[PDB]
Amino acid sequence: ALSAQQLLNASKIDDIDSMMGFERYVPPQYNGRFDAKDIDQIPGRVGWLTNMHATLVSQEVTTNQGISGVDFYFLDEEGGSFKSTVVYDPYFFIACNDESRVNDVEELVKKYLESCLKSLQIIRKEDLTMDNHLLGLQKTLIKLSFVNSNQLFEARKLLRPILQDNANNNVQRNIYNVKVDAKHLIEDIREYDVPYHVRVSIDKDIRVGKWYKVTQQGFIEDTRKIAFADPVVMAFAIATTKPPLKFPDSAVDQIMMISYMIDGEGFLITNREIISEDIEDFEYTPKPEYPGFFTIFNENDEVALLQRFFEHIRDVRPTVISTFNGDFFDWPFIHNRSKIHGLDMFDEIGFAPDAEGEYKSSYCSHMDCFRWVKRDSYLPQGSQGLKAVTQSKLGYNPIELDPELMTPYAFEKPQHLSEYSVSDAVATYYLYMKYVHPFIFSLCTIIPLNPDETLRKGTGTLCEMLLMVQAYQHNILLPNKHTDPIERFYDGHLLESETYVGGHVESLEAGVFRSDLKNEFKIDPSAIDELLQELPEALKFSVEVENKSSVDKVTNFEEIKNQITQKLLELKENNIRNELPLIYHVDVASMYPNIMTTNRLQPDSIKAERDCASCTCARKLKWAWRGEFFPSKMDEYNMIKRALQNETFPNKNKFSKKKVLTFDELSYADQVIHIKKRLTEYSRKVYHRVKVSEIVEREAIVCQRENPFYVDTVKSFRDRRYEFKGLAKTWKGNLSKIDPSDKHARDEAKKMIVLYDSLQLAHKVILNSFYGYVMRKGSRWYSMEMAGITCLTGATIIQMARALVERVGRPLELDTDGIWCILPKSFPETYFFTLENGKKLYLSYPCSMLNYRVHQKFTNHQYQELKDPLNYIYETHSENTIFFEVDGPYKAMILPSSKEEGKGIKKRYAVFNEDGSLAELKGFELKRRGELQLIKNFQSDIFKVFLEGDTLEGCYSAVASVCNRWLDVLDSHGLMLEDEDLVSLICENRSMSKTLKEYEGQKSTSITTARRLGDFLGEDMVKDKGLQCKYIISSKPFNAPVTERAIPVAIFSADIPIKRSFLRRWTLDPSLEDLDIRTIIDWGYYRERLGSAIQKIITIPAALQGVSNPVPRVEHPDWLKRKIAT
DNA sequence: AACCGCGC
DNA sequence: CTGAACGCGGA
Ligand SMILES: Nc1ncnc2c1ncn2[C@H]1C[C@H](O)[C@@H](COP(=O)(O)OP(=O)(O)OP(=O)(O)O)O1
Ligand SMILES: [Cl-]
Ligand SMILES: [Cl-]
Ligand SMILES: [Mg+2]
Ligand SMILES: [Zn+2]
């Protein structure tokens, strides 16, 4: 029935595909031996696999219904392309609670599912919840196969009610009786929701990005070919008209240009109803690497521009089309204008919106670079615009044009608009080719998804897909998706939430620290004595564990060891010192993954007294659980329920004629939501607050012999990441090694650094998601304990490192697995052991001294591993892959202080390299999206000025002067400033993550700005999420809270009568005549925001370093004034 | 004082 | 259709 309609869609997709160069190839019959080694004899066709999609195909011993399979899209060795199809029966499993009667379940379902089922068979998989699975005992399952996905789904609909009824109702008849019936032996269904395209990719072991010979026997991987083929790649950007101060609307606005690149050649299509002259061919090439020669197609009108776009696409047959935010802007705009002119985009080029509203084709991936930017670039959201991505990643400054000017320029400056247009397409193309393409296509060679999907899935889902492969290949039955309990209780209280204590963070010092200014150190001599004692084993560890060598082959072991001993002896004698610091950072390499692999942590290894039989074997580890719960007691929970049972509720389901519901008729979940809300208020009143928070120390057993498929998946991804982390580092060394002796065109090395950095960090987030995965909603491998255990072990490790550094130096800031500190310049630093072959091994003593201790204290001596699987013989050993590494030493580090007494600021600092360049800027407003622009421009001026002066006081003086420049701008009420520049500086921009409707009963500057934009510029302004609310704070109304005084800066570009009516409303001043921004602004508000910044970054830290207020126009808070009396 | 949205 | 900790300024 629906079968026959899906067959019609397939057949339409087949026509699109043949038009774009993908005819279905069916390889020749070959009765011989499907053999993989003589691949070159066997009949068939070799191809680079570039895409795949589920489909439904006809026969050409079933009926008049379609067969599920997957179309795979290939590029051939000869410059052509084709597709070929694999068919496979979808399947899922039934599990039983009584093995002895598996035959009765089988007989029952053969019949119960007669209308949908293709076949059935008894199979066995490893079940990691089952006793004696480690001695080879397997779980027996019924595998149910189907002709297609529709039939699979009917099986699920027939079976779900049985499983419901089984868990839901007690059927008593003869109370004096209870040969049980078949239904109740079905305990569950398993692997029932694995998406079909994935199921095929996993079971057949096929991946996009690899080369296959297609044969009658199936796809044969060509392991000899690894280099990718070269798809035809197109990138495009559109430019549209729009009204002043509003957003483009595709119902009325028109497309004026489409710029694009195809394999490095530019095209610009122009709409001459709008663009007021024929644009000529021109070059925009921002680096020799990025050529852009553009050819022009001046079309008479909009429809022609569209027809020219589609026809060109049909001409070149791109198999990647890339955009920047094309799923949300470009594509839908193109689709809606196409429809207005009676064109069918799907018929013209095979693109349509999918169920997510995203634009997809069969034959061509839509690689929206913005998705890679948000997921994988590691850029702050403040730098995720094309402009900022272009500077960061391609290393040049693209053309910029104010959005308000694009429509007018069509008429007035059509050449300038076209230069902007083509700049977009250039940035987009090369961003795609250099960053997105290699990453996504390479990820596809290991993740069982197509490029579109691989670009867009969450990193947690990516992890899931990796783990599923590993589980499937080791024959491990997948757990079903976890579902959170609707309500949990602790000590009779309902929990609002529960979690575990995470990373450990500390602010220890504020101030300016610089390699040419001296600091006071107080060395604990008993620390030096421990170091001296450990020294022989610590250097041996460096040689043999950190460098994988043997002291045996070391020439100068004793020399190095004397040299260190002397520096330490000196520190021990003369332990009160005043000298120049070494500014170091030490940080554990991939911290949580290594804690996990060291301790053999994975969800299936967490045993709760059952049932390793028995769980030497058990490794007990601590975590810290933290609950937040209502004060109310059970008895008062029960009270609130019956008060809700007297109430009426609206039917949320819109499909139904019934719109009043009793409490009992709502689902468990919704019942609880209402309970929670009523319990919030009852608690305040009686108690008197919402949450009570409590931390409880806990313990869990981690079995050291459990099947290690999960942790092995993490180790393997970790090694994949280290390769790129290593390359990043190797290139950094070369650019300083000898390759930095100007002049050179390396340049290439710097390009390398940026690339491998991006690649090791794109790997970092997926790697770390293997940790987060165990807490994800719907995780197949859920374990709060595993996650808790990981974090507490890391907190203990990093406090141990802090306790040492603090005895020999001064730690400044600490976060999770990293410590910024200063050490005396006399502290022993870097050496190189000489090998017999003459080679040298690097030693950073600050790092090795910590790592030696980490290995004494945090090694897992209980790690087991199958040494002989046929016999199940285990071997035990000692594991530890946790290592600090060192970066630095640096020229300076500047840490801010809080406005509150005795409190620091975590997660904000600035660090500078020896060469004077900025090495790190963390957390500050400058980096964050949105934020008051004046504060960003301030911070952007001040940090580098900490490198000036010869004394600490001179350094604070140089920065005072910049503070006084900025204070003059505000004391002068902006007068010394252009009016455009003023609006720009005073503006605060904040994203609303949802739409204005969903914020009801909340207040904030964004909400008020959005509402007023709505009233003034129309409801279209606020129908979408992600609105940028740009506003200023007004002096009036006096006595109103700040959120009532956000004015959208857009109002200052409205016609004068409009502006007037609104500023009057918004300030509650009927008779206002003065409309100058300068009289509207609340200067005291801005002076207080700037004052704050000056306190945290400059004056209060100055005070803590015993420097007297270098910026007197900003007064210390009282506590600090008071502090300074004697 | 305790909460909320956004952004290692 | 990954996690927790934190800074800021808004009863
Ligand atoms: N995105 C994340 N998701 C979950 N956990 C994270 C994430 N980012 C950081 N963490 C946790 C796990 C990390 O191991 C730990 C330390 O972070 P960090 O030192 O930045 O990275 P790392 O130790 O994993 O890599 P690196 O090798 O570069 O130091 O904090
Ligand atoms: Cl971030
Ligand atoms: Cl975020
Ligand atoms: Mg780290
Ligand atoms: Zn065990």
Side-chain angles (χ1 to χ4, degrees), chain A residues 225 683 958:
Chain A
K225 308 215 70 189
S683 290

Side-chain angles (χ1 to χ4, degrees), chain A residues 980-1006:
Chain A
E980 170 151 323
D981 258 37
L982 187 54
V983 284
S984 299
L985 260 180
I986 305 309
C987 194
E988 182 158 355
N989 180 356
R990 301 279 209 82
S991 297
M992 277 204 315
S993 71
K994 307 175 277 171
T995 58
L996 170 64
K997 300 209 119 274
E998 311 168 56
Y999 282 97
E1000 179 264 295
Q1002 296 206 324
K1003 315 186 186 156
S1004 73
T1005 47
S1006 294

Side-chain angles (χ1 to χ4, degrees), chain A residues 587-591 721 725 764 817-818:
Chain A
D587 189 299
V588 182
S590 282
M591 197 214 212
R721 182 186 177 221
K725 197 178 180 187
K764 169 175 188 190
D817 86 331

Side-chain angles (χ1 to χ4, degrees), chain A residues 742-762:
Chain A
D742 280 275
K743 181 192 146 259
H744 266 274
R746 230 198 213 102
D747 231 78
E748 145 190 286
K750 260 160 171 142
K751 211 189 276 165
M752 285 305 88
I753 287 150
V754 172
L755 177 65
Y756 288 134
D757 266 34
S758 305
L759 282 175
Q760 73 94 344
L761 294 165

Side-chain angles (χ1 to χ4, degrees), chain A residues 783-1013:
Chain A
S783 182
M784 180 181 291
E785 294 90 322
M786 194 216 81
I789 284 166
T790 305
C791 298
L792 184 52
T793 299
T796 305
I797 292 164
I798 201 57
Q799 282 165 94
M800 182 284 295
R802 200 225 52 238
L804 182 48
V805 163
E806 196 163 41
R807 290 168 78 201
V808 300
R810 283 159 70 178
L812 312 176
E813 199 272 357
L814 168 165
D815 193 331
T816 308
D817 86 331
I819 298 173
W820 286 95
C821 62
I822 48 173
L823 301 184
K825 164 168 205 61
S826 300
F827 196 90
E829 223 189 326
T830 304
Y831 306 77
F832 284 91
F833 301 106
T834 34
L835 296 173
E836 271 268 319
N837 34 320
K839 272 184 245 253
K840 42 274 139 161
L841 306 169
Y842 161 81
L843 164 70
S844 166
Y845 175 74
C847 218
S848 304
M849 82 192 185
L850 290 156
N851 286 341
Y852 172 77
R853 297 194 167 205
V854 174
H855 286 237
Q856 289 302 114
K857 300 210 175 66
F858 297 97
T859 293
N860 177 11
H861 295 293
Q862 307 172 264
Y863 198 113
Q864 309 196 37
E865 184 152 28
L866 271 166
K867 189 178 78 171
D868 170 5
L870 297 168
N871 291 299
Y872 305 107
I873 286 155
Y874 286 90
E875 191 130 79
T876 296
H877 68 272
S878 281
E879 192 81 19
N880 194 333
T881 59
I882 307 166
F883 300 92
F884 284 91
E885 55 206 12
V886 77
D887 54 286
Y890 289 100
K891 179 155 160 85
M893 181 170 197
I894 301 99
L895 306 96
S897 196
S898 148
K899 298 160 78 181
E900 309 192 27
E901 190 166 2
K903 200 196 218 221
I905 294 296
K906 294 156 181 166
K907 302 178 179 283
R908 308 203 156 190
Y909 52 81
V911 179
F912 286 91
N913 294 128
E914 274 144 22
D915 71 16
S917 54
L918 184 62
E920 264 130 48
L921 190 74
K922 312 301 203 169
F924 285 114
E925 287 84 350
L926 171 52
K927 182 164 189 181
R928 299 177 50 85
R929 184 169 61 196
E931 304 293 336
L932 177 47
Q933 183 74 35
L934 164 81
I935 293 301
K936 303 165 83 87
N937 292 4
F938 182 64
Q939 286 168 355
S940 177
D941 294 340
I942 42 70
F943 289 118
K944 59 154 70 77
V945 188
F946 280 103
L947 293 197
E948 295 182 339
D950 305 331
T951 58
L952 191 58
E953 311 86 280
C955 158
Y956 278 117
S957 287
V959 185
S961 149
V962 170
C963 299
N964 291 320
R965 249 215 321 109
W966 280 99
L967 287 180
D968 289 348
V969 174
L970 297 178
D971 291 346
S972 79
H973 285 15
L975 289 159
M976 37 171 114
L977 209 30
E978 351 284 275
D979 202 285
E980 170 151 323
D981 258 37
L982 187 54
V983 284
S984 299
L985 260 180
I986 305 309
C987 194
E988 182 158 355
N989 180 356
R990 301 279 209 82
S991 297
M992 277 204 315
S993 71
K994 307 175 277 171
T995 58
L996 170 64
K997 300 209 119 274
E998 311 168 56
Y999 282 97
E1000 179 264 295
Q1002 296 206 324
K1003 315 186 186 156
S1004 73
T1005 47
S1006 294
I1007 289 163
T1008 295
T1009 308
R1011 183 164 44 69
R1012 289 168 167 186
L1013 268 178

Side-chain angles (χ1 to χ4, degrees), chain A residues 592-827:
Chain A
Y592 290 12
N594 275 306
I595 287 169
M596 287 168 61
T597 53
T598 292
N599 292 282
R600 222 178 178 277
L601 304 179
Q602 27 171 61
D604 279 303
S605 285
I606 304 296
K607 309 297 184 189
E609 252 250 330
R610 286 282 137 122
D611 216 3
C612 186
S614 32
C615 228
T616 92
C617 197
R619 175 158 179 87
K620 298 187 204 285
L621 289 175
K622 299 283 179 43
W623 64 293
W625 171 89
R626 187 173 71 230
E628 272 145 43
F629 57 92
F630 304 93
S632 313
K633 272 107 180 212
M634 208 59 215
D635 62 289
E636 330 173 279
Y637 165 103
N638 282 312
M639 177 157 311
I640 289 277
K641 278 210 78 213
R642 21 171 211 274
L644 280 159
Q645 287 182 299
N646 280 338
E647 216 150 288
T648 249
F649 308 85
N651 191 349
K652 59 151 74 156
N653 180 214
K654 231 189 162 209
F655 282 69
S656 164
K657 266 100 165 206
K658 200 191 173 187
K659 84 280 158 175
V660 216
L661 257 40
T662 61
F663 192 67
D664 282 306
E665 293 166 89
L666 301 172
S667 62
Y668 229 128
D670 295 343
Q671 280 174 1
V672 168
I673 290 163
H674 284 111
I675 282 161
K676 295 245 206 297
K677 287 171 94 299
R678 299 298 204 72
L679 263 194
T680 57
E681 60 207 42
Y682 176 92
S683 290
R684 191 107 47 181
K685 235 175 257 157
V686 177
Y687 277 112
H688 319 245
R689 83 278 211 79
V690 180
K691 270 157 54 233
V692 181
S693 170
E694 195 184 317
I695 295 165
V696 173
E697 195 143 56
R698 294 257 232 121
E699 258 201 303
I701 288 35
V702 183
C703 168
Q704 300 292 299
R705 293 159 67 105
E706 184 57 85
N707 189 307
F709 82 93
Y710 191 117
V711 68
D712 287 354
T713 306
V714 172
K715 184 171 306 199
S716 155
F717 204 84
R718 184 253 283 156
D719 296 332
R720 181 182 300 283
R721 182 186 177 221
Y722 286 172
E723 291 290 85
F724 303 121
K725 197 178 180 187
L727 289 164
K729 195 194 62 157
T730 301
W731 271 124
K732 272 172 243 257
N734 316 149
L735 185 110
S736 64
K737 166 137 50 193
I738 290 121
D739 289 345
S741 287
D742 280 275
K743 181 192 146 259
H744 266 274
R746 230 198 213 102
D747 231 78
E748 145 190 286
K750 260 160 171 142
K751 211 189 276 165
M752 285 305 88
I753 287 150
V754 172
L755 177 65
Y756 288 134
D757 266 34
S758 305
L759 282 175
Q760 73 94 344
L761 294 165
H763 287 75
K764 169 175 188 190
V765 173
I766 293 166
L767 181 60
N768 283 332
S769 299
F770 285 104
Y771 148 71
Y773 182 76
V774 311
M775 284 292 278
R776 176 182 165 286
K777 297 191 280 288
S779 173
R780 287 192 188 266
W781 289 294
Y782 183 90
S783 182
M784 180 181 291
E785 294 90 322
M786 194 216 81
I789 284 166
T790 305
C791 298
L792 184 52
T793 299
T796 305
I797 292 164
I798 201 57
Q799 282 165 94
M800 182 284 295
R802 200 225 52 238
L804 182 48
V805 163
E806 196 163 41
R807 290 168 78 201
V808 300
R810 283 159 70 178
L812 312 176
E813 199 272 357
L814 168 165
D815 193 331
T816 308
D817 86 331
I819 298 173
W820 286 95
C821 62
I822 48 173
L823 301 184
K825 164 168 205 61
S826 300
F827 196 90

